[PDB]
Structure 1
Amino acid sequence: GSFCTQLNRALTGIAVEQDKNTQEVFAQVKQIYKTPPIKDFGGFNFSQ
């Protein structure tokens, strides 16, 4: 019967949840901010 359509649904839920997890963790910014062309940060070095 529906045992493995249930299993496919469960795997589909896991994949969708993983996509949501990554989006929630990283997409916290409405706009993509861009670093200034000059690295004049008062002596702090962010090249790394």
Structure 2
Amino acid sequence: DSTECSNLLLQYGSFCTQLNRALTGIAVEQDKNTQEVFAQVKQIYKTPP
């Protein structure tokens, strides 16, 4: 919420772009981790009564 500051920031380039990219990469890697660890069974078995 400061237009002049945003104008100044535009001069630095793509620093903030690199940061958002990196954090998105981490955020998807987390779900990759949990699926790989747990999703190893094809079906859902159930013990008999």
Counterpart Cα distance in 1 of 2:44 and 2:27: 26
Gaps of 5+ in 1: 38-48
Instruction: Give the percent of matched residue pairs that are identical in Structure 1 and Structure 2.
Output: 100
Gaps of 5+ in 2: 1-12
With normalisation by structure 2, the TM-score equals 0.67
Q: CA RMSD in A?
A: 0.8
Query: Going by fraction, where is helix more abundant, 1 or 2?
Result: 2
Q: After TM superposition, what 4+ stretches of structure 1 lie above 2 angstroms from structure 2?
A: none
Q: Flag the structure with more relative contact order, 1 or 2, with Cα contacts below 8 A and sequence separation at least 6.
A: 1
